[PDB]
UniProtKB/TrEMBL annotation, chain A:
It is found in: Mitochondrion inner membrane. Complex I is composed of 45 different subunits. Interacts with CARD15, but not with CARD4. Interacts with STAT3, but not with STAT1, STAT2 and STAT5A. Interacts with OLFM4. The chain crosses the membrane at residues 28-48. It comes from the Eukaryota. Signal peptide: none annotated. Belongs to the complex I NDUFA13 subunit family. Complex I functions in the transfer of electrons from NADH to the respiratory chain. Accessory subunit of the mitochondrial membrane respiratory chain NADH dehydrogenase (Complex I), that is believed not to be involved in catalysis. This is NADH dehydrogenase [ubiquinone] 1 alpha subcomplex subunit 13.
Length: 71, 318
């Protein structure tokens, strides 16, 4: 003869439940990304310039060794 | 002694393909909140062996309506070509040293499409035929821009020799000089290997098994091995072309370790991309490759012809 016991919601109420779309912005601006890309390209160009000039000098040296040995 | 070198190249590649199947399954499983193979062998280490033994002990079918000669020739061509495309790769020394290695890869890869073409035609079924014409369209989409990108990148190498790429990138990776070309090349290699989002020829949701739908057992297995060997080979080519390892002539093992790590990272990126995206429509692939990639590639080719002349940065070895 005890009290009625049934599955029921708790005293007061259940906590609020989220349902709305949540997609944060989470990114840099286009200007920053373009600037970083162009800077990387320029740095690579200058490094390649130095290395290619050094390689040209090395090729000239090897060709001169061949010229010395040819006769 | 040379035959020992051929065997030491071709057997480990097949083992790497076999275990790449397992690695792909596990990566896809863990990106999908599951595990993947972990029962047959510790951590699914024996799963590839079980797959191969099951396939080669299974009955092979010759379709009643099919051309038998082409039906049998196509997988042989696929596997042999996939094996052959490895011999000029410098790791840091190549098995076969060619003056024009890059053109050799280009020609052999453009020959590899006939495996799919001829298997699909010789099956004499409708889904296989649709897969074969999709292969035709895919090659028409990617070939020209792939070749122009290769030329633009190699304009700083000075030649077509693959070993010169090691000394060209002695100080800096080539990706810091041509990263737009690197992006277009990466997408082109995804399209060239029939990988998602460009896995149009198989077309699993759309075409059941597509070009290889008729194929079963051992013949079917050969196609799978060829495709995965092509995956690994193309990523190794990308690593050599854009992320150049430094080579010490008295310690080539360091170069080999670094290069293998880089190509493994690129292959895992392939698997990641497959796990992450939906599939293209095959007219959309052609429109992407002909309306966006081609004009940019032509402009960048003009730029990469002009730049060494303007800056007096022309490479050696005429
Ligand atoms: C003198 C020189 C003669 C050269 C002969 C060419 C080699 C083929 C000889 C055997 C094939 C015929 C067997 C057959 O038809 O079924 C057998 C038998 C009969 O089956 P069936 O159910 O009773 O009836 C089938 C019907 O009869 C209907 O059967 P079907 O519809 O399948 O018949 C078609 C078949 C029947 O053949 C014919 O009609 C006459 C054969 C003459 C063909 C020659 C044309 C020239 C082509 C270019 C040159 C090729 C090289 C020739 C030079 C040789 C010296 C090196 O024709 C072909 O398919 C020709 C394909 C062979 C060319 C291989 C080239 C590989 C290309 C790789 C890419 C290239 C890269 C760049 C280099 O079935 C089988 O036993 C299984 C299939 C057998 C296939 C084995 C492997 C393929 C052939 C070997 C290729 C050798 C390449 C090296
Ligand atoms: C999203 O669902 C899907 C998957 O995920 C569950 C897949 O995996 C998947 C791909 C299919 C898998 C089940 C992989 C199947 C594995 C191969 C077919 C077996 C091939 C393995 C051997 C043939 C390699 C060679 C055999 C030797 C052991 C290597 C050494 C060679 C000697 C000569 C030495 C597909 C299509 C798919 O749709
Ligand atoms: C092991 C016993 C050896 C027997 C040899 C038989 C060879 C043969 O032709 O038989 C056909 C045989 C068996 O068929 P069934 O009679 O239906 O079943 C047999 C089971 N009772 O079928 C096959 O497996 C054919 C195998 C392919 C032939 C191998 C040679 C092919 C050469 C290809 C050259 C072209 C390569 C293309 C790429 C190269 C380009 C760079
Ligand atoms: C298929 C076509 C195969 C193409 C093979 C190309 C190989 C290659 O490019 O290497 C070139 C290499 C070296 O040249 P370089 O790199 O410029 O410098 C060497 C001097 N230091 O040249 C060679 O080794 C030539 C060797 C022979 C040439 C290849 C012959 C192969 C022909 C295949 C025919 C197919 C068989 C017949 C039937 C076909 C279908 C059943
Ligand atoms: C100072 C002088 C310098 C000269 C200028 C240099 C700077 C130039 C800056 C621009 C370079 C941009 C290059 C990008 C090339 C493609 C760009 C593009 O627009 O392509 C997309 C399509 O590109 C893609 O979407 C790719 C599809 C396949 C995606 C597969 C997975 C994505 C790849 C994951 C990361 C890949 C990393 C690449 C590099 C790897 C390392 C080699 C166009 O498609 P839509 O948006 O539909 O519009 C076209 C019609 N309006």
């Amino acid at each position: 003869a005890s009290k009625v016991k049934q599955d029921m919601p708790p005293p007061g109420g259940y906590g609020p439940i989220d349902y709305k779309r949540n997609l944060p912005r989470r990114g840099l601006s286009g200007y920053s990304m373009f600037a970083v890309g162009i800077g990387t390209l320029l740095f690579g160009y200058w490094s390649m310039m130095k290395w290619n000039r050094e390689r040209r000098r090395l090729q000239i040296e090897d060709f001169e060794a061949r010229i010395a040995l040819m006769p | 002694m040379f035959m020992i070198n051929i065997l030491s190249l071709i057997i480990p590649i097949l083992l790497a393909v076999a275990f790449l199947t397992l690695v792909e399954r596990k990566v896809l499983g863990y990106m999908q909140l599951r595990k993947g193979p972990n029962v047959v062998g510790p951590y699914g280490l024996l799963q590839p062996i079980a797959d191969a033994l099951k396939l080669f002990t299974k009955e092979p079918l010759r379709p009643a309506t099919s051309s038998i000669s082409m039906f049998i020739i196509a997988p042989i061509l696929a596997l042999s070509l996939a094996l052959t495309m490895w011999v000029p790769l410098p790791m840091p020394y190549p098995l076969i040293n060619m003056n024009l290695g890059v053109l050799f890869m280009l020609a052999m890869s453009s020959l590899a499409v006939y495996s799919i073409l001829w298997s699909g035609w010789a099956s004499n079924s409708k889904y296989a035929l649709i897969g074969a014409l999709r292969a035709v369209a895919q090659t028409i989409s990617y070939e020209v821009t792939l070749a122009i990108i290769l030329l633009s990148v190699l304009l700083m190498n000075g030649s077509y020799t693959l070993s010169t790429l090691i000394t060209t990138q002695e100080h800096i990776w080539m990706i810091f000089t041509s990263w737009p070309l690197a992006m277009m090349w990466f997408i082109s290699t995804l399209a060239e290997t029939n990988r998602a989002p460009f896995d149009l020829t198989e077309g699993e949701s759309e075409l059941v098994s597509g070009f290889n739908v008729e194929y079963a057992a051992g013949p079917f297995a050969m196609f799978f091995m060829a495709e995965y060997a092509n995956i690994i080979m193309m990523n190794a080519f990308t690593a050599i072309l854009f992320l150049g390892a430094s080579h010490d002539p008295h310690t080539p093992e360091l170069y080999t370790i670094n290069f293998v790590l880089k190509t493994l990272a690129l292959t895992i990126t392939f698997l990641w991309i497959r796990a992450s995206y939906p599939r293209f429509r095959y007219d959309q692939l052609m429109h992407l490759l002909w309306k966006s990639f081609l004009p940019l590639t032509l402009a960048l080719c003009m730029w990469h012809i002009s730049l060494p002349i303007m800056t007096a940065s022309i490479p050696p070895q005429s």
